[PDB]
Amino acid sequence: GRIYAVGGYDTHLNSVEAYDPETDTWSPVAPMNTRRSGVGVAVLDGHIYAVGGSHNSVERYEPERDEWHLVAPMLTRRIGVGVAVLNGRIYAVGGYDGTHLNSVEAYDPETDTWSPVAPMNTRRSGVGVAVLDGHIYAVGGSHNSVERYEPERDEWHLVAPMLTRRIGVGVAVLNGRIYAVGGYDTHLNSVEAYDPETDTWSPVAPMNTRRSGVGVAVLDGHIYAVGGSHNSVERYEPERDEWHLVAPMLTRRIGVGVAVL
């Protein structure tokens, strides 16, 4: 499909652009009702949700009509929030309330309501979140520590820390592993991968560019590192363990949310 880059800071942006890998081109799409940076983005039922980022409203993009619609606001304001989709709900994890948050809340589109979920062990903003094997992982934040949420028990459990502390880290899942990309410690070009079978982190080739506030998405078996600091965008090829530059975005975006639709 396409990689959508939502919001971020340049001012805080309400603009959205979409990347076509077949043409290696970024194209404008309809802008959001609200300017957002440190925004979380996730895909549920063919819509992109833009969660938080202030600048506690939530909005939903319908690609067929190219428009953003408002939906129920979150119970807590959150900037630097991590967002993931698990079992038909959108989870908003941590962030900063203009206090760093350990709270978590879940959105049900069937009822258009947000509900509190068990809080994390650790307060985290600029946190990366990703879903692997039925669990939500919360990576880094304001930390090298990592935790895993299980919905059936509604509990956060600890897992192995990363080798490097990262705030503003981008996270995505490829071939059974969680990749943690960039962040701030100085801004990092380093990347590490988490294997849930062994509960261990391993080195990955570093990016060409240092990035924090970076968005990460997986399209066609490749990881894209979008923004985070120009307008550079790189793609990872796992078979060669190398990062290569692709077309840059039309706009600089730090604290961008990225999703594939």
Side-chain angles (χ1 to χ4, degrees), residues 1-21 23-54 56-63 65-162 164-229 231-261:
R2 286 201 299 183
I3 288 178
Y4 288 78
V6 176
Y9 184 83
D10 176 9
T11 52
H12 314 270
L13 303 168
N14 69 347
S15 59
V16 185
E17 58 185 289
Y19 175 77
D20 194 325
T23 62
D24 186 41
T25 299
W26 291 89
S27 304
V29 303
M32 270 184 315
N33 300 286
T34 295
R35 298 177 191 100
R36 298 173 189 286
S37 68
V39 55
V41 168
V43 176
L44 177 50
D45 281 50
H47 297 136
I48 298 167
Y49 289 75
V51 176
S54 287
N56 37 28
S57 52
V58 180
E59 311 164 59
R60 196 185 73 227
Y61 176 70
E62 328 213 346
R65 298 185 47 90
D66 186 33
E67 29 186 69
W68 293 85
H69 289 262
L70 288 159
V71 298
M74 285 188 292
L75 306 164
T76 295
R77 171 192 251 191
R78 310 175 179 273
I79 300 155
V81 60
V83 167
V85 168
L86 179 50
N87 302 328
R89 309 209 277 168
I90 309 172
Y91 289 79
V93 174
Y96 184 99
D97 173 2
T99 189
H100 299 288
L101 304 164
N102 60 11
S103 63
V104 181
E105 51 186 293
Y107 179 76
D108 181 354
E110 286 308 282
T111 58
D112 186 45
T113 59
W114 293 88
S115 286
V117 148
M120 289 189 297
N121 288 100
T122 299
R123 291 169 189 277
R124 300 173 187 282
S125 62
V127 59
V129 300
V131 174
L132 178 56
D133 305 337
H135 298 91
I136 291 156
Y137 292 74
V139 179
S142 195
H143 299 336
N144 47 10
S145 69
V146 182
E147 334 174 30
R148 206 192 65 240
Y149 177 68
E150 40 202 292
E152 329 79 348
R153 292 194 50 98
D154 185 42
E155 288 174 354
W156 290 91
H157 290 260
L158 298 189
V159 292
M162 292 177 293
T164 302
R165 316 201 180 234
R166 316 181 177 260
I167 299 140
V169 60
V171 165
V173 172
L174 176 50
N175 300 327
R177 286 156 109 217
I178 300 157
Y179 290 74
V181 177
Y184 176 103
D185 192 57
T186 192
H187 314 269
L188 300 167
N189 55 24
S190 61
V191 181
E192 27 195 323
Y194 176 75
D195 173 20
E197 212 50 72
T198 57
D199 181 46
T200 61
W201 289 93
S202 295
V204 177
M207 300 178 288
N208 295 281
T209 317
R210 297 178 173 291
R211 314 179 179 269
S212 67
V214 55
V216 181
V218 169
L219 175 52
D220 312 327
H222 290 77
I223 299 166
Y224 288 76
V226 182
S229 178
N231 322 353
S232 63
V233 181
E234 300 170 63
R235 186 184 83 131
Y236 179 64
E237 304 160 11
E239 42 285 340
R240 253 172 296 261
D241 193 28
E242 307 155 10
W243 289 89
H244 300 296
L245 287 175
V246 299
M249 296 197 284
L250 300 156
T251 300
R252 182 152 167 69
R253 298 175 189 273
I254 302 155
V256 63
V258 176
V260 173
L261 179 56

